[PDB]
């Protein structure tokens, strides 16, 4: 494969110390950038956006611009359009079309569209956005979110609390994503895999000073027990996370009115702790059976399951991704039927049959005894 | 014929097979990896040996390919301290020992004036991170929560021989439990120790029996161990490759005399009381005694309710209790019918019913026992 | 078993080099030597073992100091009654060879017999006597009824 990254280039003319790699600049220049002799390569991107009733304001972030570059944007369905930097200091306003030119060493721009569905066209070094002709060329103008693959498996349900409405489960979780900033060069370590062990994603992110997709369980009660926690990264920048967990989750949705004929749902929710413009769940991986089989009988029998990805409102605005696993469960009916209902039917039959007798003293005595038998069975 | 190629430790290609291959070293240090990809093949490799076509001599010199470090392992069980039948886990107390050889750990005595260097109260991971050398760390596969450890020590000899010692108390998950045949069930207690490193670095090679695997203790125990075994296998590992596993398995059973004497004999006597009353020809007395015996049965059932685990599904004992209760109630129903028949003046039919019941009931019980044996134990 | 709770932990040293350690502890200890076959007439041993974590050529227990009563008296009754105690120093095999010292305290204990006797055995004797005495009767219906009632009384007492 090819490789990507930044580089430092030192050129010398009749300076034999350059091959040592430590040549300091000296003399009068002799070489220059070749690309400056011609027109720069244009990038064009088109997006369709919609302003819902509660989402009348929209913002997008652009990639970095080098000095001397130019920026163009236009909108055709009229809403208002403006351009600000990352802090937000205004730079240009729409006349709808807009134009700007880069003065600083590095410019980071934000496009504001505020007011229905509209077409937004944006380009870098492309003044011909009025009549482009070519399909969108070059690299994307707006930054893109990093895509995360997620998967979860359930091994054993280890308890259900019917008074406090919570349950505990044992399982496995896996995450995988791609980030070129995490890449390294093998010749500096002589290795192909770099690993971190027994640390949460937050701790590793704080140690290496790079943003990573941290997560939490939405309904977690108390601390979580974790085993085999590991993060490892490849030179290309592909990273993955693995964990074996035992956790207790709150479940206020329980309803035991139809007991023992009730049916319940066990829902496990994993939420990213970062805004959706940074990381987002994109694919579901089935690395194992979602519901594992175990020897012997269980108190709860799983009938079906499902997995889904959604979006939920996030603190400090924006949105965060959610991964949900739901299990539909029922109790063992034979246990309750054979243990309770048949003896109760026989007890009721005893009190019914005595009315065939014509000696009412015997009937009264047997009824009195059967009431006590009923109470004894009830407390049994 | 498969394809053959040579790359360095980073993956940069250096030579390709024509199957034979050749290379010459330019850098100060060269670390090479041989790739063979496509059945069984013979691979011959040599350093400074262009005569590999016709070697003649048996393989000479040191090994060309790196070798995995060999680890000796042993485990002993002291006491089973608890079993949870609803959450399906158990807790055990025991001792673990590891031993291996590594020349990189060697030292020179004249720099310390000592023959043994030791580390205390630290896990293998912590020591490995402190001395910046790879060591064979391990974990329990089914560990639930934290583990309590005592007498944790690592010590190394000047030649490089190292050993690890630990006394542990741990709780292990066991979803393989099956209590259908309770109380006649038999279970397996499995303890798995897995290395946290790829098999090309460290591998379990030998089993050491430093003590009795199952220790004897004074007094009786709830579970009786019948046999045990120990085995080494290989299992798939994260980030590919493979890791070694050491497994100890105990076969256990319950104490049968306790259940038999505590439950089954009184139940048999209670059933006999309801059976014997059909010899009487005064049906009022029979009805009264049947009514009393049903209450006695219920009282005994709730008295033994303490030895009746609540699992959410039926065992053998629950089925037997239900059948016995149903038959005891049917006795009362038949007694009422016989009392009415005697009242109307049909005593002959009542006597015939008595004979029929006396013949039939034990046959029904025996047939139910045979059916249960057939459907649960064969 | 598990962690140990400690209070008033202090080490202090004199200029000559004399050092001392003090600790107040609450701890849970495993005891697989228990045998409850003769319950409630069983007798048990409570053994507390303190082992040095160093080879015997470095440090060794040499003397036993009785700074207080080994078994302290408390107001009220206790479930277990201590009959006698002993203290001893021995040597046991140590990891990485050599040997380490051990200090052992053993308490011999028994249960309160009056509690079990008065609570269980006397009522059981009276219940058995009720079923024995009825055979003097010559009206066998009354005998049968009283026997049937006494069996239920026995079961009720048992579960009580
Ligand atoms: C499974 C069944 C258990 C669940 C059933 C619960 C339902 C309740 C029982 C229904 C009983 C209805 C019978 C009527 C009755 O009991 O007495 C009335 C008659 C006499 O009536 P009359 O002469 O006053 O008109 O008295 C009679 O003469 C009727 C004759 C009936 C004969 C019953 C004797 C059967 C003997 C079979 C051998 C024992 C089977 C062992 C089973 C394990
Ligand atoms: C403390 C004692 C509790 C534990 C004792 C348990 C042992 C079982 C009791 C033993 C009872 C043996 C007496 C024999 C008996 O009960 O009946 C038979 C005789 C008549 O016999 P026969 O005429 O058929 O030959 O019937 C008789 O006539 C025998 C006469 C005996 C008189 C008993 C009445 C005593 C009245 C004393 C006042 C009440 C004491 C209050 C105590 C708190
Ligand atoms: C109440 C328990 C069930 C007993 C069986 C009842 C079936 C209906 C029979 C009605 C017969 C009426 C005769 C006078
Ligand atoms: C049901 C409890 C056991 C009682 C003993 C039964 C043994 C079989 C004897 C059958 C005798 C029938 C006489 C009419
Ligand atoms: C079984 C409960 C104790 C009752 C006292 C028994 C003492 C022995 C007396 C035997 C008397 C026999 C008379 C026929
Ligand atoms: C799906 C729920 C089925 C409930 C059936 C109850 C059966 C009661 C049996 C009584 C027999 C005398
Ligand atoms: C190995 C299982 C043997 C089970 C034997 C049950 C014995 C019941 C005794 C009843 C005597 C009245
Ligand atoms: C080792 C196999 C033992 C099999 C025991 C079977 C007992 C069947 C009768 C059950 C009555 C509750
Ligand atoms: C040391 C053990 C003595 C046991 C004595 C038992 C006494 C039973 C009393 C019954 C009186 C009716
Ligand atoms: C402990 C189980 C007793 C069940 C009744 C047995 C009757 C046997 C008839 C021959
Ligand atoms: C799965 C339900 C079985 C119940 C059978 C009841 C027969 C009277
Ligand atoms: C080990 C089983 C002993 C049970 C004896 C039962 C005698 C009726
Ligand atoms: C398998 C349980 C059956 C319960 C009713 C039996 C009546 C003879
Ligand atoms: C210490 C045992 C006292 C028991 C007395 C029993 C008198 C019947
Ligand atoms: Ca609820
Ligand atoms: Ca199971
Ligand atoms: Ca014991």
- Closest by Cα among B317, B310, B304, B292 to B376: B317
The answer to whether C95 is annotated as binding is no
Task: Tell me the sheet residues that pair with A324.
Answer: A269, A308
Q: Which residue has the tokens 């399982």?
A: A171
The answer to whether C32 is annotated as binding is yes
Q: From CA A199, how far away is CA A212, in angstroms rounded?
A: 13
Residue B294: Cβ-neighbour burial (10 angstroms; 0-12, 13-18, 19+): buried
Residue A100: Cβ-neighbour burial (10 angstroms; 0-12, 13-18, 19+): middle
Using the atom order of ligand 11, give the atom closest to the CA of residue A342.
8
Contacts of A356 in chain B (CB under 8 A): 336-337, 340
Residues 160-199 of B with CB under 8 A from A: 173, 175-180
> Is the CB–ligand 10 distance for residue B272 below 6 Å?
no
Q: From CA B153, how far away is CA B95, in angstroms rounded?
A: 13
A–B interface: beta-carbon pairs under 8 A = 137
The first and second tokens of residue A215, run together, are 């997560």
C-beta separation of A217 from A231 below 8 A: no
Q: From CA B31, how far away is CA B9, in angstroms rounded?
A: 6
- Closest by Cα among B187, B145, B171 to A295: B187
- The continuous run of DSSP H or E covering A178 comes out as strand A166-178
Strands A90-93 and A279-284: unpaired
- Closest by Cα among B213, B203, B272 to B242: B203
Q: Which residue has the tokens 């290795």?
A: A191
C-beta separation of B99 from B162 below 8 A: yes
Residues with Cβ within 5 Å of ion ligand 17? Answer: B 217, 219; C 32, 34
Instruction: Select from C32, C96, C155 the Cβ nearest to the Cβ of B296.
Output: C155
Q: Which residue has the tokens 């410019």?
A: A107
Compute CA distances C13 → C16, C19, C62, whole Å. 8, 4, 20
B305–A contact, CB cutoff 8 A: yes
Q: Which residue has the tokens 């030192």?
A: A10
Residue nearest to atom 3 of ligand 13 (CA): B323
Task: Tell me the sheet residues that pair with B250.
Answer: B189, B228
Q: From CA B118, how far away is CA B134, in angstroms rounded?
A: 17
A356-363 contact pairs (CB < 8 A, 24+): A356/B336, A356/B337, A356/B340, A357/B336, A357/B339, A357/B340, A357/B343, A358/B340, A358/B343, A359/B343, A362/B284, A362/B287, A362/B339
The first and second tokens of residue A122, run together, are 């944006």
- Closest by Cα among C30, C29, C24, C31 to C5: C24
- Closest by Cα among A230, B299, B183 to C148: B299
A227–B contact, CB cutoff 8 A: yes
Q: Which residue of B has its CA nearest to A225?
A: B145
Q: Which residue has the tokens 């009660």?
A: A221
Compute CA distances B152 → B95, B164, B210, C60, C96, whole Å. 11, 8, 17, 21, 12
Which of B220, B257, B263, B272 to mutate to test ligand 12, by most ligand atoms within 8 A of the CB atom? B257
The radius of gyration of chain B's CA atoms, rounded to the nearest angstrom, is 35
C-beta separation of C52 from C101 below 8 A: yes
Q: From CA B175, how far away is CA A220, in angstroms rounded?
A: 23
Within A234-352, strands assigned E span 238-250, 263-272, 279-284, 300-313, 319-331
Q: From CA B113, how far away is CA B109, in angstroms rounded?
A: 5
Give me the resolution in angstroms, 1 decimal.
2.1
Question: Per-residue DSSP letters for A40-74?
Answer: PPPEEEEEEEE--TT--EEEEEBPPB-TT-EEEEE
* b/e per residue B137-154 (b: at least 16 CB within 10 A): bbebbbbbeeeeeeebbb
- Closest by Cα among A140, A175, A156 to A64: A140
- Closest by Cα among B341, B342, B322, B320 to B330: B322
**Is B175 close to A294, i.e. CB distance below 8 A?**
yes
B144–A contact, CB cutoff 8 A: yes
- The continuous run of DSSP H or E covering A350 comes out as helix A342-353
C-beta separation of B317 from B308 below 8 A: yes
B153–C contact, CB cutoff 8 A: yes
Q: Which residue of A has its CA nearest to B295?
A: A373
Residue nearest to atom 7 of ligand 11 (CA): A338
Q: Which residue has the tokens 């979803």?
A: B175
Peptide bond between residue A260 and the one before it cis (omega within 30 degrees of 0): yes
* b/e per residue B40-54 (b: at least 16 CB within 10 A): eeeeeeeeeeeeeee
Q: From CA B172, how far away is CA A28, in angstroms rounded?
A: 74
Compute CA distances C49 → A71, A123, B151, C30, whole Å. 81, 80, 14, 11
Separation of first and last alpha carbons in chain C: 34
Full 3-state SS string of chain B: CCEEEEEECCCCEEEECCCCCCCCCCCCCCCEEEEEECCCCCCCCCCCCCCHHHCCCCCCCCCCCCCCEEEEEEEEEEEEEEEECCCCEEEEEEEEEEEEECHHHCCCHHHCCCCCEEEECCCHHHHHHHHCCCCCCEEECCECCCCEEEEEEEEECCCCEEEEEEEEEEEEECCCCCCCCCCCCEEEEEEEEEECCCCCCEEEEEECCCCCCECCCCCCCCEEEEEEEEEEEEEECCCCCEEEEEEEEEEEEECHHHHHHHHHHHHHHHHHHHHHHHHCCCHHHHHHHHHHHHHHHHHHHHHHHHHCCCCCCCCHHHHHHHHHHHHHHHHHHHHHHHHHHHHHCCHHHHHHHHHHHHHHHHHHHHHHHHHHHHHHCC
Q: From CA B79, how far away is CA B91, in angstroms rounded?
A: 9
Q: Could you tell me the distance, in angstroms and rounded to a whole number, from the CA of residue B321 to the centre of ligand 8?
A: 15
Q: Could you tell me the distance, in angstroms and rounded to a whole number, from the CA of residue B73 to the centre of ligand 15?
A: 50
Q: Which residue of A has its CA nearest to B32?
A: A190
- 3-class SS shares of chain A: helix, strand, coil, % to 5: 20, 40, 40
Residues 33-72 of C with CB under 8 A from B: 33-37, 53
> Is the CB–ligand 4 distance for residue B272 below 6 Å?
yes
**Is B333 close to A350, i.e. CB distance below 8 A?**
yes
Separation of first and last alpha carbons in chain A: 74
C148–B contact, CB cutoff 8 A: yes
- For residue B220, give how far its alpha carbon lies from the nearest alpha carbon of chain C (Å): 7
**Is C152 close to B148, i.e. CB distance below 8 A?**
no
Chains contacting C (3+ CB pairs below 8 angstroms): B
Contacts of A156 in chain B (CB under 8 A): 88, 173, 175
A125 DSSP 8-state letter: S
The first and second tokens of residue B45, run together, are 């490799």
Q: From CA A156, how far away is CA A300, in angstroms rounded?
A: 11
C1–B contact, CB cutoff 8 A: yes
Q: From CA B323, how far away is CA A338, in angstroms rounded?
A: 9
Any idea what the Cα angle at residue A291 is, between residues A285 and A296, rounded to 5°? 155
Question: What lines the ligand 13 site, CB under 6 Å?
Answer: A 338, 342; B 319, 322-323, 326-327
Sign of CA dihedral C60, C64, C69, C72: positive
Give Cβ neighbours of residue A277 (< 8 Å, ≥ 6 apart): A61, A143, A145, A318
Residue nearest to atom 7 of ligand 9 (CA): C117
Give Cβ neighbours of residue B183 (< 8 Å, ≥ 6 apart): B254, B256, B259, B315, B316, B317
Residue B89: Cβ-neighbour burial (10 angstroms; 0-12, 13-18, 19+): buried
Q: From CA B105, how far away is CA B155, in angstroms rounded?
A: 11
- For residue C145, give how far its alpha carbon lies from the nearest alpha carbon of chain B (Å): 8
Q: From CA B355, how far away is CA B334, in angstroms rounded?
A: 13
- For residue B175, give how far its alpha carbon lies from the nearest alpha carbon of chain A (Å): 6
C-beta separation of A112 from A81 below 8 A: yes
**Is B292 close to C148, i.e. CB distance below 8 A?**
yes
The first and second tokens of residue A221, run together, are 């009660």
Torsion of CA A25, A28, A34, A39, to 10 degrees: 110
Question: Per-residue DSSP letters for chain C?
Answer: ----EEEEEEEEE-TTS-EEEEEEEE-----TT---TTTTS-EEEEEEEEE-SS-TTT--------SS-SS---SS--SEEEEEEEEEEEEEE-TTSSEEEEEEEEEEEEE-HHHHIIIIIHHHHHHHHHHHHGGG-S-HHHHHHHHHHHHHHHHHHHH-
Strands A319-331 and A263-272: antiparallel
Instruction: Select from A228, A246, A350 the Cβ nearest to the Cβ of B139.
Output: A228
Contacts of C144 in chain B (CB under 8 A): 285, 289
Q: What are phi and psi of A205, to 5 degrees?
A: -60, -40
Compute CA distances A93 → A79, A113, A239, whole Å. 12, 11, 41
B275–C contact, CB cutoff 8 A: no
Q: What are phi and psi of C55, to 5 degrees?
A: -65, 155
Separation of first and last alpha carbons in chain B: 53
* b/e per residue C36-60 (b: at least 16 CB within 10 A): eeeeeeeebebeeeeebeebeeeee
CA B85, chain centre distance (Å): 14
Q: Which residue of C has its CA nearest to B115?
A: C96
Give Cβ neighbours of residue C12 (< 8 Å, ≥ 6 apart): C19, C20
Residues 286-325 of A with CB under 8 A from B: 294-300
Q: From CA B371, how far away is CA B365, in angstroms rounded?
A: 10
Q: From CA B15, how far away is CA B35, in angstroms rounded?
A: 11
Q: Which residue has the tokens 């001392």?
A: C20
Residues with Cβ within 5 Å of ion ligand 15? Answer: A 165, 252, 254
- For residue B312, give how far its alpha carbon lies from the nearest alpha carbon of chain A (Å): 5
Which of B330, B334, B337 to mutate to test ligand 1, by most ligand atoms within 8 A of the CB atom? B337
- Closest by Cα among C133, B28, B329, B31 to A192: B31
How many CB atoms lie under 10 A from the CB of residue A152?
22
SS3 A274: coil
Question: What lines the ligand 3 site, CB under 6 Å?
Answer: A 348-349, 352
Q: From CA A160, how far away is CA C4, in angstroms rounded?
A: 31
Strands B69-84 and B202-207: parallel
Taken as a whole, chain B contains a residue count of 378
Q: From CA A59, how far away is CA A49, in angstroms rounded?
A: 11
Give Cβ neighbours of residue B199 (< 8 Å, ≥ 6 apart): B68, B234, B237, B241, B242, B243, B244
**Is A373 close to B333, i.e. CB distance below 8 A?**
no
How many CB atoms lie under 10 A from the CB of residue A274?
21
Contacts of A377 in chain B (CB under 8 A): 298
- Closest by Cα among C148, A355, C137, A364 to B277: C148
Q: Could you tell me the distance, in angstroms and rounded to a whole number, from the CA of residue C148 to the centre of ligand 2?
A: 21
Q: What are phi and psi of A208, to 5 degrees?
A: -95, 0
The first and second tokens of residue A128, run together, are 């011909």
Instruction: Select from B239, B288, B302 the Cβ nearest to the Cβ of A193.
Output: B239
Q: From CA C49, how far away is CA C102, in angstroms rounded?
A: 7
- Closest by Cα among A69, A47, A49, A45 to A58: A49
Q: From CA A231, how far away is CA A240, in angstroms rounded?
A: 6
Q: From CA A262, how far away is CA A277, in angstroms rounded?
A: 42
Any idea what the Cα angle at residue A137 is, between residues A134 and A138, rounded to 5°? 160
Q: From CA A377, how far away is CA A372, in angstroms rounded?
A: 9
Q: Could you tell me the distance, in angstroms and rounded to a whole number, from the CA of residue A374 to the centre of ligand 1?
A: 21
Q: From CA C101, how far away is CA C62, in angstroms rounded?
A: 9
Compute CA distances A61 → A89, A113, B135, C11, whole Å. 14, 12, 47, 63
- Closest by Cα among A41, A47, A40, A39 to A122: A47
Q: From CA A126, how far away is CA C159, in angstroms rounded?
A: 93
* b/e per residue B324-360 (b: at least 16 CB within 10 A): bbebbbbbbbbbbbbbbbbbeeeeeebeebbeebeee
Q: From CA B366, how far away is CA B360, in angstroms rounded?
A: 10
Strands A166-178 and B186-195: unpaired
Strands B242-254 and B3-8: unpaired
Question: Per-residue DSSP letters for A180-239?
Answer: GGG---GGGTT-S-EEEES--HHHHHHHHT-----EEETTB-S--EEEEEEEEE-TTSEE
B223–C contact, CB cutoff 8 A: no
Which of A352, A356, A357, A367 to mutate to test ligand 3, by most ligand atoms within 8 A of the CB atom? A352
Give Cβ neighbours of residue A108 (< 8 Å, ≥ 6 apart): A61, A62, A64, A65, A85, A86
The first and second tokens of residue C10, run together, are 């202090």
Contacts of B267 in chain C (CB under 8 A): none
C-beta separation of B136 from B165 below 8 A: no
Strands A146-161 and A279-284: parallel
């Amino acid at each position: 494969t090819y490789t990507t990254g930044s580089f430092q280039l030192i050129l010398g003319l009749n300076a034999p110390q350059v091959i040592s790699g430590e040549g300091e600049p000296e003399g009068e220049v002799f070489a220059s950038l070749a690309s400056l002799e011609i027109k720069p390569e244009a990038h064009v991107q088109e997006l369709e956006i919609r302003l819902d009733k509660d989402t009348r304001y929209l913002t997008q972030h652009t990639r970095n611009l080098q000095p001397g570059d130019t920026f163009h944007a236009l909108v055709e369905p009229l809403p208002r359009l403006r351009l600000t930097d990352s802090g937000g200091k205004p730079l240009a306003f729409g006349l709808v079309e807009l134009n700007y030119t880069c003065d600083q060493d590095i410019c980071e721009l934000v496009v504001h569209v505020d007011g229905a569905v509209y077409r937004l066209l944006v380009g870098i070094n492309a003044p011909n956005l009025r009549e482009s002709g070519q399909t969108p060329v070059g690299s994307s103008v707006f930054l893109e979110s990093d895509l995360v693959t997620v998967g979860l498996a359930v091994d054993q349900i280890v308890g259900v609390d019917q008074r406090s409405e919570n349950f505990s489960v044992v399982g496995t979780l896996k995450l995988s994503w791609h980030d070129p900033k995490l890449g390294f060069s093998p010749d500096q370590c002589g290795c192909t895999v770099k690993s971190f062990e027994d640390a949460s994603i937050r701790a590793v992110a704080g140690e290496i000073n790079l943003p990573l997709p941290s997560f939490s369980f939405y309904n977690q009660q108390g601390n979580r027990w974790s085993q085999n926690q590991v993060i490892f990264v490849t030179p290309d920048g592909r990273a993955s996370y693995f964990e074996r967990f035992t956790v207790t989750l709150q479940a206020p949705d329980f309803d035991f009115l139809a007991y023992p004929f009730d049916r319940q749902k066990f829902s496990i929710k994993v939420d990213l702790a970062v805004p959706t413009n940074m990381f987002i769940f994109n694919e579901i991986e089935r690395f194992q059976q979602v519901v594992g089989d175990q020897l012997g009988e269980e108190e709860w029998v799983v009938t079906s399951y499902s997995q889904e990805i959604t979006e939920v409102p996030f603190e400090r605005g924006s949105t965060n991704s959610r991964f949900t696993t739901t299990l539909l469960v029922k109790r063992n009916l034979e246990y309750y039927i054979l243990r309770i209902f048949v003896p109760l039917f026989l007890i009721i039959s005893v009190s019914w049959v005595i009315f065939f007798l014509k000696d009412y003293g015997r009937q009264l005595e047997v009824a009195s005894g059967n009431l006590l038998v009923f109470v004894a069975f009830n407390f049994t | 014929l498969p394809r053959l190629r040579l790359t360095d430790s980073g993956g940069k290609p250096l030579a390709f097979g024509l199957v034979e291959l050749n290379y010459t070293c330019d850098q100060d240090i060269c670390e090479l990896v041989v790739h063979v990809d496509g059945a069984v093949y013979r691979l011959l490799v040599g350093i400074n040996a262009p005569n590999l076509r016709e070697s003649g001599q048996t393989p000479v010199g040191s090994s060309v390919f790196l070798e995995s470090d060999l680890v000796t392992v042993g485990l002993a069980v002291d006491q089973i301290v608890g079993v949870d039948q609803r959450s399906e886990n158990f807790s055990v107390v025991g001792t673990l020992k590891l031993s291996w050889h590594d020349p990189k750990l060697g030292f020179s005595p004249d720099q310390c004036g000592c023959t043994v260097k030791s580390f205390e109260d630290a896990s293998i991971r912590a020591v490995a991170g402190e001395i910046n050398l790879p060591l064979p760390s391990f974990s329990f596969y089914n560990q639930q929560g934290n583990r309590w450890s005592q007498n944790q020590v690592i010590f190394v000899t000047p030649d490089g021989r190292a050993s690890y010692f630990e006394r542990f108390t741990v709780t292990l998950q066991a979803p393989d439990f099956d209590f259908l045949a309770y109380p006649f069930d038999r279970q397996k207690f499995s303890i798995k120790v897995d290395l946290a490193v790829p098999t090309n670095m460290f591998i379990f090679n030998e089993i050491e029996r430093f003590q009795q695997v199952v220790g004897d203790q004074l007094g009786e125990e709830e579970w009786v161990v019948t046999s045990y075994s120990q085995e080494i296998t290989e299992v798939p590992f994260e980030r590919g490759s493979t890791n070694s596993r050491f497994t100890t398995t105990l076969l256990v059973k319950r104490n049968l005399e306790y259940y038999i004497l505590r439950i089954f004999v009184p139940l048999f006597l209670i059933i006999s009381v309801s059976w014997v009353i059909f010899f009487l020809k005064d049906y009022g007395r029979q009805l009264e005694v049947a009514s009393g015996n049903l209450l006695v049965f219920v009282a005994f059932n709730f008295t033994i309710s303490g030895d009746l685990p609540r699992l959410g599904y039926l065992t053998v004992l629950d089925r037997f209790m239900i059948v016995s209760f149903c038959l005891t109630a049917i006795v009362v129903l038949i007694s009422v019918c016989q009392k009415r028949l005697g009242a109307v003046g049909k005593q002959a039919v009542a006597a015939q019913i008595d004979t029929w019941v006396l013949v039939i009931y034990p046959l029904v019980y025996s047939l139910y026992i045979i059916w249960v044996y057939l459907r649960f134990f064969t």
